[PDB]
């Protein structure tokens, strides 16, 4: 029995999961008590202890949730079918038609993220329950997953259920002022486990091959793979888009088609069948004692969010392009992903179109926005931008350059202990912070000796005000550490 809460349709969950957490892990660097030129970001609104603003955290949450209250237009079903076949057909030529076996319980468990929470039904972080080098989950999480695993092999799907929260991160000061904060959907571990067992080996297949498929997820942007992607762009007209509100504008029927494409490369199994039932059913966000059930869109915290969203993205652009040709009564003779070159990571994309498609691009963009997507925004480019990196020429080859402001903000802010005051001195370890700032310097070096010098002066100032010792502080050494990563394939 449904009711209204902050203007949302909502029901009582049978539980109480608690409210929005208070304070931030972010502290202003002890070295930088003053406002610097070119600063855009500060920690996002974090409730009553936050003396910068005056917002209700739940109203902030509810604002995040309002687009999930609306269904999206989507793709008319005959077009959709045609789109799906281009997508599935192209993938078959790249990773073949082998069907991967479902993982075992222990493999799937190994792959759960231990630094993160168990979702709404088990309390704490998954790590709390990890017996290191007995290499298994123990305790209340082990019981939760065992029961889930056992129910799924009987063909009983887990719940698509999320602990609702908001992300603690630096955001633009302009969004902070507007009382914005991003949603954090903490998935039920049971559900992550099942879907992991169903699809990890298919996701791995796509990753091993990256960027041969428009699913870029797993690409190392600091290696040869980025150059392979840069190369593929030549000979087309380039559009670089980043899509507004990507997760909230995803249509259920597109998502179900994406799930069935992944299913095509998996073993037909009760587990797979259970994972598809769960991931294609409406998302359910728990906060306090209520729950909100989505009417459309996808939670940003679902298992395989990036993979699924990138396949959705392939479906949608296939549809828009073929729809555009259709309305002009021109034939489309080959595969969409051969004739054009697509690269996606959810809503983030580069499209390298052929001259014919380029000529009708206004209608491609109107089809996309007719599906309920918001491309943002317009016009061909000569600068590729992907995953926040701008592809740039350097004296040692092209690189995918990290924004200078993303480098420098790491020097003015540090992640440390929870607080309601970002200007209180931090408690943190020096080893990890120093490592953070040596990497930053290696990234800065790719911008050349003039930008490097400016980040070096900032780094020397940080190091002394924060009590640090750093090594990548000179140009040649920093260039040398970035080079070792680039040719070695070394994370990062």
From Swiss-Prot:
Positions of the RdRp catalytic domain: 236-361
Coiled coil region boundaries: none
Reactions it catalyzes: RNA(n) + a ribonucleoside 5'-triphosphate = RNA(n+1) + diphosphate; Endopeptidase with a preference for cleavage when the P1 position is occupied by Glu-|-Xaa and the P1' position is occupied by Gly-|-Yaa
Domain notes: Protease-polymerase is composed of two domains displaying two different catalytic activity. These activities may act independently.
Functional summary from the UniProt entry: Protease-polymerase p76 processes the polyprotein: Pro-Pol is first released by autocleavage, then all other proteins are cleaved. Cleaves host translation initiation factor eIF4G1, eIF4G2 and PABP1 thereby inducing a shutdown of host protein synthesis. This shutdown may not prevent viral mRNA from being translated since viral Vpg replaces the cap. It is also an RNA-directed RNA polymerase which replicates genomic and antigenomic viral RNA by recognizing specific signals. Also transcribes a subgenomic mRNA by initiating RNA synthesis internally on antigenomic RNA.
Protein name as it appears in the record: Protease-polymerase p70
Species, as recorded: Sapporo virus (strain Human/United Kingdom/Manchester/1993) (Hu/SV/Man/1993/UK)
Lineage of origin: Viruses, Riboviria, Orthornavirae, Pisuviricota, Pisoniviricetes
């Amino acid at each position: 029995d449904e009711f209204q809460w902050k203007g949302l349709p909502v029901v009582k969950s049978g539980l109480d999961v608690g409210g929005m957490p208070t304070g931030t892990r972010y502290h202003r660097s002890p070295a930088w008590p003053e406002e610097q030129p070119g600063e855009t970001h500060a920690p996002a609104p974090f409730g009553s202890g936050d003396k910068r603003y005056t917002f209700s955290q739940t109203e902030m949450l509810v604002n995040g949730l309002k687009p999930y209250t609306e269904p999206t237009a989507g793709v008319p079903p005959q077009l959709l079918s045609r789109a799906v076949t281009h997508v599935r057909s192209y993938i078959e030529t790249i990773i073949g038609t082998h069907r991967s076996p479902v993982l075992t319980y222990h493999q799937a468990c190994e792959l759960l993220e231990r630094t993160t929470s168990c979702g709404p039904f088990v309390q704490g972080l998954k790590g709390d329950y990890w017996d290191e080098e007995q290499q298994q989950y123990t305790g209340v999480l082990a019981n939760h997953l065992e029961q889930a695993w056992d129910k799924a092999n009987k063909g009983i799907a887990p719940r698509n259920a999320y602990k609702l929260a908001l992300k603690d991160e630096l955001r633009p000061i302009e969004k902070n002022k507007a009382g914005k904060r991003r949603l954090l959907w903490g998935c039920d571990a049971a559900t992550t486990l099942i879907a992991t067992a169903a699809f990890k080996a298919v996701a791995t297949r796509l990753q091993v091959v990256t960027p041969m498929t428009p699913v870029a997820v797993g690409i190392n942007m600091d290696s040869v793979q980025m150059q392979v992607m840069n190369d593929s762009l030549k000979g087309g007209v380039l559009y670089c888009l980043d899509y507004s509100k990507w997760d909230s504008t995803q249509n259920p029927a597109v998502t179900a088609a994406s799930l069935a494409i992944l299913e095509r490369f998996a073993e037909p199994h009760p587990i797979v069948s259970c994972a598809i039932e769960a991931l294609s059913s409406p998302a359910e966000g728990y906060v306090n004692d209520i729950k909100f059930v989505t009417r459309g869109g996808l939670p940003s915290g679902m298992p395989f969010t990036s993979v699924v969203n990138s396949i959705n993205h392939m479906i949608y652009v296939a549809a828009a392009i073929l729809q555009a040709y259709e309305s002009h009564n021109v034939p489309y003779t080959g595969n969409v992903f051969q004739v054009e070159t697509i690269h996606t990571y959810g809503g983030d994309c580069m499209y390298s179109v052929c001259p014919a498609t380029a000529s009708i691009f206004h209608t491609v963009l109107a089809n996309l926005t007719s599906y309920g997507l918001k491309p943002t925004a317009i016009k061909p480019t000569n600068t590729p931008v992907f995953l926040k990196r701008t592809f740039t020429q350097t004296p040692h080859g092209i690189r995918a350059l990290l924004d200078i402001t993303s480098i420098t903000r790491q020097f003015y802010w540090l992640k440390a202990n929870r607080t309601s005051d970002p200007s209180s001195p931090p408690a943190f370890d020096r080893q990890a912070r120093s490592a953070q700032l040596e990497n930053a310097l290696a990234y800065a070096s790719q911008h050349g000796p003039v930008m490097f010098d400016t980040v070096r002066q900032i780094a020397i100032k940080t190091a002394q005000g924060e009590g640090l010792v750093l090594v990548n502080t000179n140009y040649d050494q920093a260039l040398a550490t970035y080079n070792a990563w680039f040719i070695g394939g070394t994370p990062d």
